[PDB]
């Protein structure tokens, strides 16, 4: 007897899953929490040849009205996954198990989207999310992005640096903090380490990192993140809701539509000239710390957008 | 200086890349061989923010006319030491490569089997996509629920089990397998059950909305079997649903002489098929790759 009009895909220990279950319970809708992490051992999934033939723990779930996709946990290296001991035992069968799970849950989510479920960030957007492709998709569509160079060739790095000036490097797909390109990094000894993996070099923008939240083609807020460095022993972070011009808004909405996102926390940043460049759009953006430090409500609009799909 | 009008993504050590290259070479079009197995340690690619700024080994390769995608992707020393890092490193490489491909596709390149198809290709969703669009598919059940498979058998009759994905011989579900002890093995080992079809395993190749051939795989001996225009229509439809440009499909016939689509493949092999039934697969493929250079 469970209602599956709103499904929150994710583990119930994810603070953001909890936050949405609560934003939803307090508006009336109990949600169905779909934890893939317990698929083989503690969950039942059965799929029939018909896209409507979907049975989770015995109950049929043909078409939720809306899904909030926090994470499918496809990789053992994913955020909310403790797979360390299993990977230290056999990295091969664990990878196999995660791919085995992935194809089934992906099939569930794709069947749902086919049926008309409003998936708040459908996994199909993965293709447009690839950053070296995402930034070009935005650039050639008229949004400004940093002067970039994804590469494994040190000479390309040297010439891009001589073209641009101060530069940062950061991961191609993600997983580490961006850091200033220092002169030590251009010495042969370490710049030749690009043969192990490419990295992303970009023009060092000096302005303000602004996080813009977009839900269903509307900007919820725009939070300016400032690093307070008056005291070097307690460097803190001040986050402030700010007004952005309508031009900037419409550009963020366009970008969200280009990549294929419904709920997106995108990061932009201004150059020396005080004008924003798009840095990245996130497919399962977090919001809790921003809400807290900036005194805004992001979870509320998301829950309302989810509930508006049942109507 | 190279042509880069037609790009073959794959290793030179691969027989298919070889056939396709040799066949292309013969036809007059020398291709480029993006041997992405060399990517980090040997070759170099550089991407700029402008989709055209794609530089492989120093030579700009924006917008090829057509791409044949075969393959894109030793680690035990590294994963047993740091698996999180090694997985992340491989993700960095694959991200750069997948991008090159996606950039080409956005710019106009007819990629023969674009990676975007992977979404539509996930089988427990692929067969639902085929069915829900009116195509004949076998009754199927993906499950880890033993009660579900007991009723699926009871409803469809004798049936088979094929792996959830990948490679293992299709086997017949026998009554001995339905006992508590034997059936409970799927409590954590999901496989795909399907109504047992009795007709011939027939493989059909589709390129640009046209069937090329069909061979009854009956030492195994496979031979060409012409089929109705109806099933051909159904085949090209299925390939246009999944979003493939060159596909090698498996279809099987029921007892009533009607065919059911079993599976389309992201990049099907053809060397061990055109050398056992005497038809030409690589030829029409190269013809299509060249034909795009006029669009």
């Amino acid at each position: 007897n469970l209602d599956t009009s709103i499904v929150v895909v994710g583990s119930p220990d994810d603070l953001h899953v909890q936050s949405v279950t609560e934003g939803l319970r307090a508006r009336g809708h109990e949600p169905y929490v779909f934890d893939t992490q317990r698929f083989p051992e503690e969950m039942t999934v059965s799929l029939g040849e018909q896209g409507a033939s979907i049975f989770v723990d015995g109950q049929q779930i043909a078409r939720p009205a809306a899904v909030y996709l926090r994470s499918l946990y496809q990789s053992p290296g994913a955020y909310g996954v403790d797979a360390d001991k299993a990977m230290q035992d056999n990295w091969r069968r664990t990878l196999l198990a995660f791919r085995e799970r992935s194809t089934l849950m992906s099939a569930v989510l794709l069947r749902w989207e086919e049926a008309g479920t409003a998936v708040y960030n459908s996994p199909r957007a993965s293709a447009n999310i690839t950053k070296p492709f995402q930034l070009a998709l935005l650039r050639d569509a008229g949004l400004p992005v940093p002067r970039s160079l994804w590469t494994n060739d040190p000479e390309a790095v040297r010439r891009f640096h001589a073209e641009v000036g101060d530069c940062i490097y950061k991961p191609v797909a993600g997983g580490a903090r961006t850091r200033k390109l220092e002169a030590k990094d251009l010495e042969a000894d370490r710049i030749e380490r690009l043969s192990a993996a490419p990295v992303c070099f970009q023009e060092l923008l000096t302005g303000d990192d602004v996080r813009v939240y977009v839900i269903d083609d509307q900007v919820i807020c725009a939070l300016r993140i400032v690093t307070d460095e008056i005291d070097f022993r307690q460097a803190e972070e001040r986050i402030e809701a700010i007004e952005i011009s309508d031009e900037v808004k419409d550009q963020c909405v366009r970008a969200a539509k280009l990549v294929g996102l419904r709920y997106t926390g995108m990061d932009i940043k201004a150059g020396a000239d005080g004008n924003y460049r798009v840095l990245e759009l996130n497919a399962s953006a977090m919001f809790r710390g921003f809400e807290g430090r900036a005194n805004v409500d992001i979870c509320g609009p998301l829950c309302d957008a989810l509930i508006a799909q049942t109507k | 200086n190279l042509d880069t009008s037609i790009v073959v993504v794959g290793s030179p050590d691969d027989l298919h890349v070889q056939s396709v290259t040799e066949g292309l070479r013969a036809r007059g079009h020398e291709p480029y061989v993006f041997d992405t197995q060399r990517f980090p340690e040997e070759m170099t690619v550089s991407l700029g923010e402008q989709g055209a700024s794609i530089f492989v080994d120093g030579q700009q390769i924006a917008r090829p006319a057509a791409v044949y995608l075969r393959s894109l992707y030793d680690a035990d020393k590294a994963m047993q030491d740091n698996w999180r890092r090694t997985l992340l490193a491989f993700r960095e490489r694959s991200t750069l490569m997948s991008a090159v491909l996606l950039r080409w596709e956005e710019a106009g390149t007819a990629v023969y089997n674009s990676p975007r198809a992977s979404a539509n290709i996930t089988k427990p969703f692929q067969l639902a996509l085929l069915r829900d669009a009116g195509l004949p598919v076998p009754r199927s059940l993906w499950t880890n629920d033993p009660e579900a498979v007991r009723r699926f058998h009871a409803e469809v009759g004798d049936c088979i089990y094929k792996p959830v994905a990948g490679g293992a011989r299709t086997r017949k579900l026998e009554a001995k397998d339905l006992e508590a002890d034997r059936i409970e093995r799927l409590s954590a080992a999901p496989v795909c059950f399907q109504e047992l079809l009795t007709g011939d395993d027939v493989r059909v190749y589709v390129i640009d909305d046209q069937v090329i051939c069909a061979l009854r795989i009956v030492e195994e001996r496979i031979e060409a079997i012409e089929i109705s225009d109806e099933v051909k229509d159904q085949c090209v439809r299925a390939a246009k649903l999944v979003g493939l440009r060159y596909t090698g499909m498996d279809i099987k016939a029921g007892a009533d002489g009607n065919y059911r689509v079993l599976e389309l493949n992201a990049s099907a092999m053809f060397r061990g098929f055109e050398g056992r039934a005497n038809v030409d697969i690589c030829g029409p493929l190269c013809d299509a790759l060249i034909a795009q250079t006029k669009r």
């Binding site: 290296g77 994913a78 955020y79 996954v81 490097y169 950061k170 991961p171 993600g174 997983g175 580490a176 903090r177 850091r179 990094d185 370490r190 710049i191 380490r193 690009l194 192990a196 993996a197 990295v199 926390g265 996130n282 497919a283 399962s284 953006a285 977090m286 | 740091n82 999180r84 890092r85 090694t86 992340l88 490193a89 960095e92």
Partner: peptide, 18 residues
């Protein structure tokens, strides 16, 4: 790796919002 801190678990939430 050039960015030596990729696989450092210091999971690090640098990949959280992905």
């Amino acid at each position: 790796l050039f960015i030596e801190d990729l696989g450092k678990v210091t999971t690090t939430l640098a990949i959280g919002e992905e």
